[PDB]
Amino acid sequence: FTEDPLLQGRLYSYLDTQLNRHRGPNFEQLPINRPVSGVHNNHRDGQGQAWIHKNIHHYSPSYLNKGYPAQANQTVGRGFFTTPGRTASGVLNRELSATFDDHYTQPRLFFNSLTPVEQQFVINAIRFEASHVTNEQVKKNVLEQLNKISNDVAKRVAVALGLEAPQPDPTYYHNNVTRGVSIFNESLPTIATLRVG
Amino acid sequence: EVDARQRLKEVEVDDNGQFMTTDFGGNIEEQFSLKAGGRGSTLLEDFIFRQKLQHFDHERIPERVVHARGAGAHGIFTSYGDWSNITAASFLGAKDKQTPVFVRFSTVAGSRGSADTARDVHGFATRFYTDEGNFDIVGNNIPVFFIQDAIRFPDLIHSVKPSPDNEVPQAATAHDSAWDFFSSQPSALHTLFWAMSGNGIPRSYRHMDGFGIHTFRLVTEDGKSKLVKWHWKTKQGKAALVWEEAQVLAGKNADFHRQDLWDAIESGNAPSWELAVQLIDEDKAQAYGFDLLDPTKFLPEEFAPLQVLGEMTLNRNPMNYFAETEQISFQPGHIVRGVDFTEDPLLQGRLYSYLDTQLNRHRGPNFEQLPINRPVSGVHNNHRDGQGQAWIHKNIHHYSPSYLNKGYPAQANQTVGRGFFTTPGRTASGVLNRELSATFDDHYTQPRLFFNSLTPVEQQFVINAIRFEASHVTNEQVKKNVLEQLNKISNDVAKRVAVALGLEAPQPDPTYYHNNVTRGVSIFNESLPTIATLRVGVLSTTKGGSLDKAKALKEQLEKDGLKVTVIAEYLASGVDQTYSAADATAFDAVVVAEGAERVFSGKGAMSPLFPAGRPSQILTDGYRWGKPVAAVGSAKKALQSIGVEEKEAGVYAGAQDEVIKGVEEGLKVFKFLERFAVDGD
Amino acid sequence: EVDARQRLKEVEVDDNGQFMTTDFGGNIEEQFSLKAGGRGSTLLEDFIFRQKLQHFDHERIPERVVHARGAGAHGIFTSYGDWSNITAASFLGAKDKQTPVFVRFSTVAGSRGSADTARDVHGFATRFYTDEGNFDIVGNNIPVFFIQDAIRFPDLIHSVKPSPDNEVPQAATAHDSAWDFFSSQPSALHTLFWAMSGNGIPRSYRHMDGFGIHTFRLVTEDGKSKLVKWHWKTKQGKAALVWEEAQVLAGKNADFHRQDLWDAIESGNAPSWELAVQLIDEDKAQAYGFDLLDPTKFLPEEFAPLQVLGEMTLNRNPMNYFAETEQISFQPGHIVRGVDFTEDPLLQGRLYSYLDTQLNRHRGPNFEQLPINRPVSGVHNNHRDGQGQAWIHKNIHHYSPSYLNKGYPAQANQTVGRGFFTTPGRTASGVLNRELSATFDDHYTQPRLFFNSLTPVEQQFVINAIRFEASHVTNEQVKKNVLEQLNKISNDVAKRVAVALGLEAPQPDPTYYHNNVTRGVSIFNESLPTIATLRVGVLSTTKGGSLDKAKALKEQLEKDGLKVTVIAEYLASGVDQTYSAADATAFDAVVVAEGAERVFSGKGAMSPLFPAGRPSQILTDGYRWGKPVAAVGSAKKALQSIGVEEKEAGVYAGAQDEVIKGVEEGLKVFKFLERFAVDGD
Amino acid sequence: FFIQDAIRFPDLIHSVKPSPDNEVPQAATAHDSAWDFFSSQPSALHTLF
Amino acid sequence: EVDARQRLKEVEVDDNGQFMTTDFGGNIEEQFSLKAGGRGSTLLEDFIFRQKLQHFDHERIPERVVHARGAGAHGIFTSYGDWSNITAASFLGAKDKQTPVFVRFSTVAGSRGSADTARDVHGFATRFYTDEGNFDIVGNNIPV
Amino acid sequence: WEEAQVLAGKNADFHRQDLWDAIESGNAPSWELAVQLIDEDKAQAYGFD
Ligand code: HEM
Ligand code: HEM
Ligand code: HEM
Ligand SMILES: *[C@@H]1O[C@H](CO)[C@@H](O)[C@H](O)[C@H]1NC(C)=O
Ligand SMILES: *[C@@H]1O[C@H](CO)[C@@H](O)[C@H](O)[C@H]1NC(C)=O
Ligand SMILES: *[C@@H]1O[C@H](CO)[C@@H](O)[C@H](O)[C@H]1NC(C)=O
Ligand SMILES: *[C@@H]1O[C@H](CO)[C@@H](O)[C@H](O)[C@H]1NC(C)=O
Ligand SMILES: *[C@@H]1O[C@H](CO)[C@@H](O)[C@H](O)[C@H]1NC(C)=O
Ligand SMILES: *[C@@H]1O[C@H](CO)[C@@H](O)[C@H](O)[C@H]1NC(C)=O
Ligand SMILES: *[C@@H]1O[C@H](CO)[C@@H](O)[C@H](O)[C@H]1NC(C)=O
């Protein structure tokens, strides 16, 4: 793993949520969830336990089980290991890094890298969905944030909402472009399974 | 003037003007995870993150095994008189006696998230929070059900629900397994016909009748009883959509019926139903050509007329959908003194199933303690413990009989304590059997009665519906089995349906044919008693002062009680909705404002603000779906573009005053059936 | 003088003077099944039977994974001072500030039905229902714990609990797997020694001290931190039983501790504890010969004396055991503003474990909504839904940040809203590792420090306890491994344990040997400050008018606060208990009333009313287990029948005034250690 | 993805999911609460596009 | 020599000479928590800790509402003859016909952990794993 | 009874240990399945039901 704060929380969330769906800790024993590599540990009991463990000495360390199931690491047993070089440094903090501050540059980069008609579909999508918002101040907040991404996009979306979000705010405007973000630009490599009426 | 949800106020939580906290108290923040450094890993000691996420991760509960898709609201039932002469039920025991109620409407097959406007049997579940316990009338909008025995319910539901290999199709009976079961189990044919008619695709929950379906018993104080059928009579009038409209509406707005019910209550237009009953003696069980214990049969009103007992009105929406609507647990076993069951084999099995299924949904025994499930009459018994036990019992002697508790809580029966009692006259006699009675054998006579009692155009909708669904069946032999069973009901129906499938229908089978007709099984036949809350789409334009007089048209229509939406290119001053967000399915009548012809024609109909031909598509769809259409002044050229003349019925072209008068009276007719073709030219 | 359970009143249900009902209301009777005929089968439509039985069938919930066997009660905590300069905790915020509390005591390994007097570590879980959220101190009666890392907890518990093939032995560490783990994981040796001493078999919950074990942080409002250890000091004084006594008591009265706690509060003799703390500087974490993050170590009071914060008193028993005691959900993660965690690896893993395990017991995320689990300070957040959602939230905008809800519920931190905050000065540094610090490596020094601080007879009890349990170990190499680890702590202890096992003790290993002693780790050392609620068994007889003297003897003893029990052959006037129902384990002292010698000889000790030699066995057991024993007047013959001299320590003989004065004095000594032999002889 | 920290995940979903009072609209972000969150939380703008 | 637990052999797990793994496979060590520093706090990304502790935390299921305290064993039932003249039961359908069985004995009132030698009515429940479905004779040591 | 009380404390696992040891030591216990057959018309013929 990495120190992505979004990834960090998922690790907890996805394991916990299975307790709700499956109503037990033995959801991995389900045929679709089972691995092909085998399972050997000191986990016993729980709801819907499907196996019958033969090892009565279900703990580590132990003389009676001769140290089996055994510990595996980087050098022995081909076990999992965290990257040796990874380190922690600094104060314990409930805050995001200053490097996470930019929210407007890449959105514009994506919009720049689309075709003229694709750019219209994106605006038409915002035009459609933004009109369903009943609260006036919320629509003003939307155009205010859209104006930071692009002035033309803010103004074009604004005309459908029946108001102005005009005055440019060029803190984050640019003309850079990147490959492969578009869909309608390229042609399909195969027409197999395509339907004809 | 008393609030319907008054009892639920004590459990309500106001978070306004407060700091964020945990579930165990103490003020907190929850917008940042605790990290080991500026760009560090999240700590396990972060209790604020885990307590927040754990609750989110465990939000979902299992949906209902059937009727997963639905919506509801609170209300008040009022009894018109003292009905002690026919029943000992306390909620019907006095004139002007009011009882709080909660009603939940639903479809059947579709899962949570499925469309409201899918073709299906609909649910009509009503609870009476009476002063002698909760009484539930769990019913449907169709007076008969598919099967005759409750043991066959999983077989019915497995067949109609999506195929288990791919889980397709969603919320639809138009597939092999469904029509395999209808042909293999021909008792289901009757409910099939109702489901293929207007009852399958109703306008809204407000425009449905409701039925208890089963024959129940009403018992007096002395033990004497009478057989009873429950009926909910809509005061808004019956109304139904067309199928081609219903399909489009499913995608355009899957929340059509629940939002309709919500907007009606919020706007001060609370829907109401009258509670009616068909009362007959015990000796009439097998008197009218069928068995009253058979749930696949209804009792014609010619043999037993409707007797109105009271009126229910739904006037309060829920504040939290999940806590109230989703969590509510209806049961046909929820019975009170003055009522009793019958030996209907389908009903008999439901009493077990509904109590059992709550163990799965609520994951514990204590589901009646939930605010929405609680009665207003009080709960006193020796039930202890269980998961989520909300109370603390004071009586340490939780058993009976007992000297230590002084005989309390005490036993109650017919003579003492106004306790429930089974009808004393009821008897059992005969061998223990796994059989059905010989009186249940006729599966074709009533389906024919229902088909005969529809209008020619209504008969066409049922046939066209069968044609549509039967054509999706891949298996050839299954389609032959379907036409074989349809032929037993009617040869003409089997002939016409066979045309679409490209098969030859079998020769006439005159065993079950008849020309009888019955009262009150129709829809597109009778006009609505009120056009209040009906929706009108005013197609206008931003260019050339067309929007000014469209607002005047809107203003006049609102006085009569109509919900109006002015359509334009963008949300200008007076514009409610854009053409991009507009569709014909969301309106009962489409009106073209004067000066709005430009958007139907050349330059103006192809603006980037909406898809190509959107203004013209709305009026065209509205006309093809039978809705009263109109066009004010020079807007009659808009009708000329789509090819519709200004003479034919349901089309109103002229001045503003004439259009309003024509549109309003057109909404009473609702659907104009002369635009739909019948078989044979 | 406020009621500690005043918030709980609103969820109490009284069934007195009421008729029996269902869970959904409506009066009923439930003593007869609905049958089809006089001798017929039970009907499925019988809703009264199934609704009653369903709740009974689903009564049980999963027991606690550990500390399953336990009991508790409500109370009030009172702060002795304003403690703002050391902590921001509100419940320690002012002098004479009262906060409600619930405390639960427990064993560890035994299941819900196990004996109270089994040898084990005892739980001491205390909750503070403060005005800024629930604060829990989940502690034990022993200051140190077995393991150093929380990931090893399943390994510890699996080893001590019954063998998974036969589930034997119940509530006991006297088997192969337990001592295999203790010897294989040397860190567990310290808590072992505590467990083998009087702390393993305490007199009652009221005669136990309590410890938080882990080092926590006390944080001030300005953000200055101090390392802290929690201590509960009993005002009843420490007291413990002997092992041979505890074994018999486990069978005679399994409910000994919970009945004792119940009777003390009921009689009006409420127990009390003083909340004390050891304050250490942040730079003195590794300055006392060990690491303060290590949970296997305790800090001697010579280095840091206790600072008394306040007093707790338990004065209210629960109305319902299940609803209150069984359902309460303690968590070390229940922390409030003013307190913070540390980097103890055992504590770090607990924070996850306790919140997670509630999903098992309560089958849902809304366990904090249960009456016993609710805070008194209010709950406001964007948590919605979940299994058994009890409230109805009014705020439709259940998210943040948000304009629509106007930033409510608002965020709270250190300077705003008095929200929780981690110690500002804390930091992290180094590589991400799956290791334990080298400062944790000493496993043998403090166990030796504990043993040195016990009295000779107390040291013998520890060795005799090890002798008993180690002899049950069938595997010889496991017993050899135990002696090897015991030898590292002390050679003398190893040799004295080896002789009972018949094995040659290993040669001395002086690496960790020392002669240091510490204060306050003893029990029998001290005398009791009060003798209230203590139990005296008056052995009398129904013949010869012995009850008159016994009644006058009882009347006097009860005036000093003692609970006296007059024993006879049968329940005559003034007789509390029969000889058949009586046992020495139930009493703290045994006094033979005058004229009750007849029941110790031939006929008289051979009555059909009780087993042979019962009266003599009670006195023999009482004397052999070290209790104060007495005999009034001619009752001296009874002491001579069992070979006990009348003038030794804790043996009183003479007139009524002399016997009463002696026994009351002997109960303060409680246990006479001179009747227990020490090694060498 | 919309958000930068995982603790904000319930806030994101609650806003995009149907309104809790009526459970409307189904499978759509075209309503007040969703666009209130997107504007109030600018990090979501990229995935929105 | 017939093994009563022959059918159960397929679900048996042997951990002798094996490495430690998770419940989703892949070898691991599970004696040290992942820490951010030598004396640091435990990381939330320690998947090995939580997967191990989650299974421990959820080990317990609810005990039986009655007959909580009990113990059982496997066996073999043998019919002495063909009892077709009195019953159509398949397991009593022929002489020397063997059927596997499992018997659990118990008390009534006591919860899990209670003593065996407490005074109570005792359970005697026997299952017959017959060739035409499971047949249970759930009984007691007292006839009434 | 006086034996049973002390045994409950000394060895709570008395019966399950006894059953286990019997099977391990090669002393498997046995029971004979017996039945009392009565005719349908004699259900209330022996002074009770
Ligand atoms: C004509 C007879 C029937 C009628 C009128 C009917 C109607 C309904 C309705 C309206 C609901 C939704 C209740 C709500 O609003 O929450 C429902 C759900 C349900 N139905 Fe029926 N149904 C019938 C037949 C059956 C049968 C034969 C069975 C099986 C014995 C059955 C089993 C169920 C179950 C288990 C639920 C879910 C209840 C819950 O989760 O609360 N139904 N039915
Ligand atoms: C300082 C060492 C520990 C102490 C003093 C301690 C104390 C306690 C106490 C008193 C209880 C019973 C609470 C009650 O009265 O209801 C308990 C239960 C429990 N303990 Fe611990 N414990 C310790 C270590 C651990 C560790 C390391 C773990 C694993 C990470 C753990 C996991 C649990 C669990 C899952 C429960 C059941 C909680 C419930 O069901 O409410 N404990 N512990
Ligand atoms: C007629 C005399 C009865 C006998 C001989 C009897 C026998 C038994 C036995 C042997 C068990 C434990 C089964 C095992 O080994 O796991 C048991 C448990 C149980 N008993 Fe009975 N019982 C009787 C009456 C009843 C009655 C009248 C009820 C209520 C209708 C009842 C409800 C239960 C329940 C719910 C269990 C738990 C079953 C489980 O969780 O697997 N018993 N009984
Ligand atoms: C792309 O444009 C950005 C503006 O945000 C600029 O900072 C950067 O130098 C450009 N990179 C190139 C050369 O692609
Ligand atoms: C109702 O119960 C009463 C006793 O409370 C009893 O005397 C009476 O017979 C019962 N009623 C009937 C009609 O069975
Ligand atoms: C039709 O109605 C008539 C009423 O005249 C009735 O006698 C008859 O039984 C009904 N059924 C058929 C199939 O004719
Ligand atoms: C707490 O929140 C406030 C805003 O409410 C902010 O000004 C402050 O920086 C935050 N942190 C601290 C340390 O108070
Ligand atoms: C026993 O005596 C006193 C308590 O009465 C105590 O201070 C002392 O520490 C104890 N003895 C030892 C060796 O610890
Ligand atoms: C024992 O006490 C002495 C004197 O306080 C101290 O110097 C030493 O560190 C302690 N530890 C041992 C085991 O010697
Ligand atoms: C049934 O037949 C068996 C032998 O096959 C015989 O021993 C037994 O007496 C018969 N039982 C009855 C009751 O007829």
PDB file of N, CA and C in Angstrom, chain A residues 8 11 19 26 28 40-47 51-52 54 69-72 77 79-80 86, chain E residues 11-15 17-23 27-30 45 50-51 54-55 58-59 61:
ATOM      1  N   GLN A   8      -6.189   4.230   2.569  1.00  0.00           N
ATOM      2  CA  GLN A   8      -5.989   3.803   3.960  1.00  0.00           C
ATOM      3  C   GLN A   8      -7.294   3.402   4.648  1.00  0.00           C
ATOM      4  N   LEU A  11      -9.201  -0.045   3.411  1.00  0.00           N
ATOM      5  CA  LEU A  11      -8.694  -1.297   3.980  1.00  0.00           C
ATOM      6  C   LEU A  11      -9.537  -1.757   5.171  1.00  0.00           C
ATOM      7  N   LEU A  19     -19.382  -8.098   7.322  1.00  0.00           N
ATOM      8  CA  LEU A  19     -20.087  -8.539   8.529  1.00  0.00           C
ATOM      9  C   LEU A  19     -21.581  -8.219   8.458  1.00  0.00           C
ATOM     10  N   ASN A  26     -17.138 -15.848   8.602  1.00  0.00           N
ATOM     11  CA  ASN A  26     -16.689 -16.931   7.718  1.00  0.00           C
ATOM     12  C   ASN A  26     -17.158 -16.766   6.266  1.00  0.00           C
ATOM     13  N   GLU A  28     -15.280 -15.775   3.805  1.00  0.00           N
ATOM     14  CA  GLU A  28     -14.198 -16.226   2.922  1.00  0.00           C
ATOM     15  C   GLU A  28     -14.307 -17.718   2.590  1.00  0.00           C
ATOM     16  N   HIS A  40      -4.339 -21.999   6.135  1.00  0.00           N
ATOM     17  CA  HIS A  40      -3.817 -22.616   7.359  1.00  0.00           C
ATOM     18  C   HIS A  40      -3.507 -21.561   8.419  1.00  0.00           C
ATOM     19  N   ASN A  41      -4.331 -21.521   9.462  1.00  0.00           N
ATOM     20  CA  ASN A  41      -4.143 -20.590  10.580  1.00  0.00           C
ATOM     21  C   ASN A  41      -4.868 -21.082  11.836  1.00  0.00           C
ATOM     22  N   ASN A  42      -4.846 -20.278  12.900  1.00  0.00           N
ATOM     23  CA  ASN A  42      -5.486 -20.631  14.173  1.00  0.00           C
ATOM     24  C   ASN A  42      -6.877 -20.006  14.365  1.00  0.00           C
ATOM     25  N   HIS A  43      -7.560 -19.704  13.261  1.00  0.00           N
ATOM     26  CA  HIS A  43      -8.917 -19.146  13.310  1.00  0.00           C
ATOM     27  C   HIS A  43      -9.942 -20.248  13.523  1.00  0.00           C
ATOM     28  N   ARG A  44     -10.677 -20.176  14.629  1.00  0.00           N
ATOM     29  CA  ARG A  44     -11.726 -21.158  14.902  1.00  0.00           C
ATOM     30  C   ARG A  44     -13.093 -20.544  15.116  1.00  0.00           C
ATOM     31  N   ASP A  45     -14.100 -21.394  14.939  1.00  0.00           N
ATOM     32  CA  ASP A  45     -15.485 -21.099  15.299  1.00  0.00           C
ATOM     33  C   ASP A  45     -16.093 -19.985  14.446  1.00  0.00           C
ATOM     34  N   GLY A  46     -17.079 -19.288  15.003  1.00  0.00           N
ATOM     35  CA  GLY A  46     -17.792 -18.239  14.293  1.00  0.00           C
ATOM     36  C   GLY A  46     -19.034 -18.789  13.625  1.00  0.00           C
ATOM     37  N   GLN A  47     -19.822 -17.890  13.047  1.00  0.00           N
ATOM     38  CA  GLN A  47     -21.097 -18.256  12.440  1.00  0.00           C
ATOM     39  C   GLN A  47     -20.902 -18.922  11.077  1.00  0.00           C
ATOM     40  N   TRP A  51     -15.622 -25.866   8.084  1.00  0.00           N
ATOM     41  CA  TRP A  51     -14.542 -26.856   8.182  1.00  0.00           C
ATOM     42  C   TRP A  51     -14.480 -27.507   9.564  1.00  0.00           C
ATOM     43  N   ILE A  52     -13.672 -28.559   9.663  1.00  0.00           N
ATOM     44  CA  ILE A  52     -13.409 -29.246  10.932  1.00  0.00           C
ATOM     45  C   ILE A  52     -11.898 -29.353  11.145  1.00  0.00           C
ATOM     46  N   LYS A  54      -8.245 -30.036  12.522  1.00  0.00           N
ATOM     47  CA  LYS A  54      -7.653 -31.196  13.201  1.00  0.00           C
ATOM     48  C   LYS A  54      -6.668 -30.802  14.308  1.00  0.00           C
ATOM     49  N   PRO A  69       0.724 -24.144  12.653  1.00  0.00           N
ATOM     50  CA  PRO A  69       1.208 -23.416  11.472  1.00  0.00           C
ATOM     51  C   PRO A  69       2.303 -22.392  11.782  1.00  0.00           C
ATOM     52  N   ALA A  70       3.308 -22.334  10.909  1.00  0.00           N
ATOM     53  CA  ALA A  70       4.536 -21.574  11.160  1.00  0.00           C
ATOM     54  C   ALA A  70       4.488 -20.151  10.608  1.00  0.00           C
ATOM     55  N   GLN A  71       5.341 -19.292  11.162  1.00  0.00           N
ATOM     56  CA  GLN A  71       5.420 -17.890  10.756  1.00  0.00           C
ATOM     57  C   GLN A  71       6.188 -17.755   9.444  1.00  0.00           C
ATOM     58  N   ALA A  72       5.669 -16.927   8.541  1.00  0.00           N
ATOM     59  CA  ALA A  72       6.315 -16.659   7.258  1.00  0.00           C
ATOM     60  C   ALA A  72       6.567 -15.163   7.097  1.00  0.00           C
ATOM     61  N   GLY A  77       9.413 -18.745   4.133  1.00  0.00           N
ATOM     62  CA  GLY A  77       8.004 -19.095   3.926  1.00  0.00           C
ATOM     63  C   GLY A  77       7.265 -18.272   2.882  1.00  0.00           C
ATOM     64  N   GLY A  79       6.315 -15.187   2.899  1.00  0.00           N
ATOM     65  CA  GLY A  79       5.224 -14.456   3.540  1.00  0.00           C
ATOM     66  C   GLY A  79       5.121 -13.027   3.042  1.00  0.00           C
ATOM     67  N   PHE A  80       4.043 -12.348   3.420  1.00  0.00           N
ATOM     68  CA  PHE A  80       3.871 -10.931   3.098  1.00  0.00           C
ATOM     69  C   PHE A  80       4.835 -10.092   3.933  1.00  0.00           C
ATOM     70  N   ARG A  86      10.076   1.954   3.785  1.00  0.00           N
ATOM     71  CA  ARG A  86       9.017   2.881   4.201  1.00  0.00           C
ATOM     72  C   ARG A  86       9.206   3.372   5.633  1.00  0.00           C
TER      73      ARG A  86
ATOM     74  N   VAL E  11     -14.319 -32.293   4.736  1.00  0.00           N
ATOM     75  CA  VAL E  11     -14.248 -30.920   5.260  1.00  0.00           C
ATOM     76  C   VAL E  11     -13.169 -30.723   6.335  1.00  0.00           C
ATOM     77  N   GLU E  12     -12.361 -31.752   6.586  1.00  0.00           N
ATOM     78  CA  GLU E  12     -11.309 -31.677   7.603  1.00  0.00           C
ATOM     79  C   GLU E  12     -10.079 -30.925   7.095  1.00  0.00           C
ATOM     80  N   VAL E  13      -9.461 -30.149   7.985  1.00  0.00           N
ATOM     81  CA  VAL E  13      -8.295 -29.330   7.645  1.00  0.00           C
ATOM     82  C   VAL E  13      -7.080 -29.730   8.480  1.00  0.00           C
ATOM     83  N   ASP E  14      -5.997 -30.086   7.793  1.00  0.00           N
ATOM     84  CA  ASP E  14      -4.738 -30.466   8.432  1.00  0.00           C
ATOM     85  C   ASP E  14      -3.752 -29.301   8.338  1.00  0.00           C
ATOM     86  N   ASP E  15      -3.279 -28.830   9.491  1.00  0.00           N
ATOM     87  CA  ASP E  15      -2.352 -27.692   9.559  1.00  0.00           C
ATOM     88  C   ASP E  15      -0.921 -28.098   9.934  1.00  0.00           C
ATOM     89  N   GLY E  17       2.836 -28.980   9.532  1.00  0.00           N
ATOM     90  CA  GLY E  17       3.914 -28.635   8.602  1.00  0.00           C
ATOM     91  C   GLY E  17       3.554 -27.559   7.590  1.00  0.00           C
ATOM     92  N   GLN E  18       2.584 -26.715   7.938  1.00  0.00           N
ATOM     93  CA  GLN E  18       2.093 -25.666   7.039  1.00  0.00           C
ATOM     94  C   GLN E  18       2.512 -24.285   7.533  1.00  0.00           C
ATOM     95  N   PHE E  19       2.606 -23.332   6.610  1.00  0.00           N
ATOM     96  CA  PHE E  19       2.878 -21.936   6.962  1.00  0.00           C
ATOM     97  C   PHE E  19       1.579 -21.212   7.313  1.00  0.00           C
ATOM     98  N   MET E  20       1.700 -20.151   8.108  1.00  0.00           N
ATOM     99  CA  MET E  20       0.554 -19.317   8.487  1.00  0.00           C
ATOM    100  C   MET E  20       0.028 -18.541   7.286  1.00  0.00           C
ATOM    101  N   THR E  21      -1.295 -18.489   7.149  1.00  0.00           N
ATOM    102  CA  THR E  21      -1.942 -17.734   6.072  1.00  0.00           C
ATOM    103  C   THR E  21      -3.124 -16.921   6.592  1.00  0.00           C
ATOM    104  N   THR E  22      -3.654 -16.060   5.730  1.00  0.00           N
ATOM    105  CA  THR E  22      -4.909 -15.359   5.999  1.00  0.00           C
ATOM    106  C   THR E  22      -6.083 -16.246   5.583  1.00  0.00           C
ATOM    107  N   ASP E  23      -7.302 -15.780   5.847  1.00  0.00           N
ATOM    108  CA  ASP E  23      -8.516 -16.493   5.428  1.00  0.00           C
ATOM    109  C   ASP E  23      -8.778 -16.386   3.918  1.00  0.00           C
ATOM    110  N   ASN E  27       0.708 -16.514   2.452  1.00  0.00           N
ATOM    111  CA  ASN E  27       1.429 -16.734   3.710  1.00  0.00           C
ATOM    112  C   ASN E  27       1.707 -15.434   4.466  1.00  0.00           C
ATOM    113  N   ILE E  28       1.719 -15.519   5.796  1.00  0.00           N
ATOM    114  CA  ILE E  28       1.897 -14.343   6.660  1.00  0.00           C
ATOM    115  C   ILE E  28       2.589 -14.663   7.988  1.00  0.00           C
ATOM    116  N   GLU E  29       2.956 -13.603   8.708  1.00  0.00           N
ATOM    117  CA  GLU E  29       3.295 -13.687  10.133  1.00  0.00           C
ATOM    118  C   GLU E  29       2.291 -12.834  10.907  1.00  0.00           C
ATOM    119  N   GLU E  30       1.865 -13.320  12.070  1.00  0.00           N
ATOM    120  CA  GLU E  30       0.793 -12.666  12.837  1.00  0.00           C
ATOM    121  C   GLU E  30       1.077 -12.601  14.346  1.00  0.00           C
ATOM    122  N   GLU E  45      -3.572   0.214   8.207  1.00  0.00           N
ATOM    123  CA  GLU E  45      -3.323  -0.630   7.034  1.00  0.00           C
ATOM    124  C   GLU E  45      -2.801  -2.036   7.373  1.00  0.00           C
ATOM    125  N   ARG E  50      -6.163  -7.063  11.705  1.00  0.00           N
ATOM    126  CA  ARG E  50      -7.624  -6.943  11.718  1.00  0.00           C
ATOM    127  C   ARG E  50      -8.347  -8.209  11.263  1.00  0.00           C
ATOM    128  N   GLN E  51      -7.813  -8.880  10.243  1.00  0.00           N
ATOM    129  CA  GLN E  51      -8.396 -10.140   9.759  1.00  0.00           C
ATOM    130  C   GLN E  51      -8.292 -11.252  10.806  1.00  0.00           C
ATOM    131  N   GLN E  54     -10.676  -9.876  13.850  1.00  0.00           N
ATOM    132  CA  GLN E  54     -12.088  -9.899  13.456  1.00  0.00           C
ATOM    133  C   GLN E  54     -12.688 -11.287  13.649  1.00  0.00           C
ATOM    134  N   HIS E  55     -11.939 -12.314  13.261  1.00  0.00           N
ATOM    135  CA  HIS E  55     -12.412 -13.690  13.384  1.00  0.00           C
ATOM    136  C   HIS E  55     -12.527 -14.113  14.849  1.00  0.00           C
ATOM    137  N   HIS E  58     -15.644 -12.378  16.567  1.00  0.00           N
ATOM    138  CA  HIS E  58     -16.921 -12.944  16.126  1.00  0.00           C
ATOM    139  C   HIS E  58     -16.994 -14.473  16.276  1.00  0.00           C
ATOM    140  N   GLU E  59     -16.249 -15.033  17.227  1.00  0.00           N
ATOM    141  CA  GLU E  59     -16.219 -16.493  17.425  1.00  0.00           C
ATOM    142  C   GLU E  59     -17.510 -17.061  18.014  1.00  0.00           C
ATOM    143  N   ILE E  61     -21.413 -17.765  19.038  1.00  0.00           N
ATOM    144  CA  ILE E  61     -22.796 -17.788  18.564  1.00  0.00           C
ATOM    145  C   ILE E  61     -23.705 -17.929  19.787  1.00  0.00           C
TER     146      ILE E  61
END
